[PDB]
Amino acid sequence: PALKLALEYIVPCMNKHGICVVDDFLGKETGQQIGDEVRALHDTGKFTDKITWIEGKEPGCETIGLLMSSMDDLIRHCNGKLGSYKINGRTKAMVACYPGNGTGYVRHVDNPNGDGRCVTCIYYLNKDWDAKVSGGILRIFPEGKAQFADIEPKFDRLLFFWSDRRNPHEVQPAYATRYAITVWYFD
Ligand SMILES: O=C(O)CNC(=O)c1n[nH]c2ccccc2c1=O
């Protein structure tokens, strides 16, 4: 399954566009589970835009580990073909919560200063996101296109994009609680 998705979709889509959306990545059950785990971290005080870092062995986080393992399976089966990068690892999972008070994240590049992070991978957990009323769109400005790309933070959506200056991006103001989990893979 990872072989097929990696080589029939993620590799070609990324090499062409530098951005790749995989809807329905883990399915509604496992999704909801990860979502219930992120919410339990949050409501029990464990955020510090607020964030918390997770390795994947800590408590209340088993299924976030399964997510990370599932992401890793995709990247491993890209076979060094994704942007001709030989990927050597990734960060821990960064869980982010925009509380829903109009806050967002201003336009930025993830790796502006030349660290080894090459691919940003984000998994979204927001069921029945009403983007027209709730805001919180991810807007990416891919270098070499005169049109931006708008990505809704939809439940069980996995997203890949190049981390460097090819992809300046912003989280537009969010008016409902918005959750996402990011890892960065490095070459
Ligand atoms: O959630 C999204 O759709 C995109 N989100 C981001 O680009 C983003 N990028 N870099 C960060 C660094 C530290 C803390 C939060 C973030 C963050 O949400």
Ligand SMILES: [Fe+2]
């Ligand atoms: Fe970012």
